[PDB]
Design a protein around this ligand. Sequence first.
Ligand SMILES: OC[C@H]1O[C@H](Oc2cc(O)cc(/C=C/c3ccc(O)cc3)c2)[C@H](O)[C@@H](O)[C@@H]1O
Length: 504
Amino acid sequence: MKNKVQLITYADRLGDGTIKSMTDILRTRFDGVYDGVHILPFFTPFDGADAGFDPIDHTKVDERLGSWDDVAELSKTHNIMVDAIVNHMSWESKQFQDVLAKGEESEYYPMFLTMSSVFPNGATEEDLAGIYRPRPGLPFTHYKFAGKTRLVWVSFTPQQVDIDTDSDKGWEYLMSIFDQMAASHVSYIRLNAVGYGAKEAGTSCFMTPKTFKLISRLREEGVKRGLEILIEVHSYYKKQVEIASKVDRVYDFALPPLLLHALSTGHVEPVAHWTDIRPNNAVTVLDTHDGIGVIDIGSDQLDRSLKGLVPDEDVDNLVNTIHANTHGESQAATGAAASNLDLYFVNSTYYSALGCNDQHYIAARAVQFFLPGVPQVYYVGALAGKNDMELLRKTNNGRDINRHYYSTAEIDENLKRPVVKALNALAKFRNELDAFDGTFSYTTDDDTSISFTWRGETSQATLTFEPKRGLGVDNTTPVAMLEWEDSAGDHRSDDLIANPPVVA
Ligand SMILES: OC[C@H]1O[C@H](Oc2cc(O)cc(/C=C/c3ccc(O)cc3)c2)[C@H](O)[C@@H](O)[C@@H]1O
């Protein structure tokens, strides 16, 4: 993966509402800022219950958004990342409807997992209770195979039936997806829900040896087609390290909340610890298309004795801090859970989670860019967007607080703001200075300061982070200082908003 900043966006929520418009925005307004882009699911349909992640036909671009030729066109100027939903598919797919019609006579019967698929001999209460769950309840629902009531395996909504990733038909399906991506010049694949894609009795059916075997298989097929695979998993952080040593790339989901903690308390010891131990084959983010993950720093939710990177009280305090900084906006969008340790994500734009403090936000982005890994910027964050309460009240979908629809006009108006221009200049600095292609190091004081240094063949840079200097949501004191050396000698910026860095 190129070591350049990428954009995460919906095709229809950035510009006029099409892949062509999104491409035009990227090329005309973010040249040199975002040299790659992760296009969120744009298949048929993109506007269902789960904003494109519940496709009926994963292989056809929604004709309202564009075509695969548009993806091919975009690939000529940007590296493209796309999702591959490998664990399940719509119960409204033609295949599953065929299984409902013909049952075991269906050509696609072996393609879908049932309880009997995994437990041909019966299952114990321990067998079923031990399955790792993103949603409450057992992963089964009732469907009728031509007349016969069957329990279909469903890791998520009952409308998303899980496929047998080990069957010939299922694998054929996955490889059809891979063949289209490969045919439209996509570079990177984000394997959605891949950790659940392998089922085996007596195990958690989540990131087991079988799951890793599946991932490696998909990897070989990808490289055979020129597609690199990215793994997405929200889990207890130690499991994240473990998984990261076994795959090409994972997300760094701990950093966003770690930076919220640092900027709200001034403590940097957790950030230094995570820096020391984190997996470096990472994609770094602050905001995503989902809510802010708190489980990723995370007392283990199956065994609360394995403590996270901060005490549980600091986790509760983090959630409450987002609530306070947003003056209750996130409370309206987050479902209450009777205890903040039970929470999975907190629905708020990152900029809003910081109380819209420009200095804090630009500092967070700087840290993100200085840690090993490819940085991604979510489009809302690319425009320093606030919580969209109108859309939330319209749809009652919590996550929509962080999924504002930006018209071209709105984009151009927000591009005049100093913090946005500071982020653009910062991403240019991160994309153009070759120091970041060299070697990484860092120093720490005890709890006040931490300095990340990259040294390269023709440049060097050190970012010093000291949140202790600028406490307060209304604070305007810079909390990040930057020194770097390029063609023009040594340079220093003590305010990344007022004095964004420019490489010679
Ligand atoms: O399609 C369903 C969703 O898939 C992805 O989200 C995931 C993908 C995944 O592999 C695991 C999870 C985990 C949920 C979860 C985890 C731990 C827990 O304790 C409770 C719940 C979420 C997309 O990004 C999201 O937009 C989409 O809606």
